Amino acid sequence: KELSFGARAELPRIHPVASKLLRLMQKKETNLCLSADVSLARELLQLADALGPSICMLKTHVDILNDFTLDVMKELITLAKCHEFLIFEDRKFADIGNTVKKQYEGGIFKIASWADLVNAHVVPGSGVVKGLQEVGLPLHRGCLLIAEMSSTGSLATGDYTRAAVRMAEEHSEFVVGFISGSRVSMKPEFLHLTPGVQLEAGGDNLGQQYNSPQEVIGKRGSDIIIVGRGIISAADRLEAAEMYRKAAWEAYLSRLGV
Amino acid sequence: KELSFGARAELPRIHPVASKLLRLMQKKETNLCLSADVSLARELLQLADALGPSICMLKTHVDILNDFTLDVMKELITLAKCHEFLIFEDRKFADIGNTVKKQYEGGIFKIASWADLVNAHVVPGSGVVKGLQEVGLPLHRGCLLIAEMSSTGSLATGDYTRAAVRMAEEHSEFVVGFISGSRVSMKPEFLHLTPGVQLEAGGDNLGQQYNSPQEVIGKRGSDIIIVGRGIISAADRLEAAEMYRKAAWEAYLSRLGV
Ligand SMILES: *c1cc(=O)[nH]c(=O)n1[C@@H]1O[C@H](COP(=O)(O)O)[C@@H](O)[C@H]1F
């Protein structure tokens, strides 16, 4: 059998951040990551508080926050601890190792000081991971590698996707899984998180493509759905989050045998 | 014959930002872009002022500035106008179109308000360019596409590089050239800018690889060298910049027939 999230949390080679995430997914019956794509701190924090019980993870783009300060992120941490979710900065690092370490630790945002997870593109080669890990390992953080993208014309296919998987294997002390559209690794230690998710068929006018939670989790074998506009643009964002949570959770149970 | 920078500035299909850059390269006898990889505003501005006459372009990572404010960038603009160089934010956008437009226009940094040029990875497909251009076209800006990377294990090779070139062709109203290690397009309208440049052989401990200006400009056919540590770590950064300027310029002249 495929192992439950709770059993995967105990695997010998599991990363501590992956284990914490898997435990809380199991406890809370949620494999939903909220993509909190808003430009105001007040809305970010109001969403994190109201939707915290429904999510395993809150994904940020702090570079879109108009009123970012480090005190906003301290508050977000308080909510993350209160409601039990991880914070994932969706920074999609994509430069040489020497540069991404600086971008991860420093500047105004100090990402590594508050983000449990970040992600990186594999296009620069494995130095991108080596650079991030210089900062992230001492801070006990984890990283996801972008093995596939949800957008039209994505070049993250075929051998590129295979290279991402190898790179994750080779840096398993820091890399905890993937951003992908589907299961890309057979090794249950790795998490699969999938953006490009809505209940209805469609896309946007700038290349985004959507697939349903049942497709993504149930048929394609991914672990967590990442949902932005499907929730954020809804009138009642709490009920929307609950719809997405129930869809992804039941897809997971049905794949497990439950 | 290959056309001089001055003649390329007049090509029918030249982008206005490319034409301004080419004119100033010609006027100033410089095809050097300073990679101003420092974490303090005072050092950024002191370098921009002292090295401004020697450079065609100053490349930033504002996400590494510890004391970024928009008033720092206004000052940098003053120096850019005074010394005649373009400002290039090396943000290496790599998300879906809807997201990168937000990251380009908004947040704390307001990149599009002060950067003449930005760059983007092609991995997401052409929506990345469509999203940036939503913001950049009305602001009269330009973009470079990352067709090749300088780092060990780069996946930006073969068909990936070819896709970058096609994508540039298809968005020539906004895309003015490439970040690459070599000439990748035959069309003289496109600029080639090459990072991974030092006078001496070597690399760093996080995957960077260096080639010389003579190799990059003279043999590989690129237009502009991008140099960070080769200048920034030197004691006399002005003399280092002049060494790099003379190397790249003479390589260009010798390729032209001069
Ligand atoms: C990143 C990588 C990828 O493959 N797709 C993708 O959409 N992203 C980011 O994920 C969310 C999707 O939000 P949406 O549900 O509103 O389309 C965005 O934040 C995007 F940046």
Ligand SMILES: *c1cc(=O)[nH]c(=O)n1[C@@H]1O[C@H](COP(=O)(O)O)[C@@H](O)[C@H]1F
């Ligand atoms: C970006 C893309 C790429 O292919 N290579 C590369 O180095 N970058 C960026 O360019 C400079 C190189 O600086 P250096 O001369 O000190 O190595 C860095 O800012 C890096 F981010």
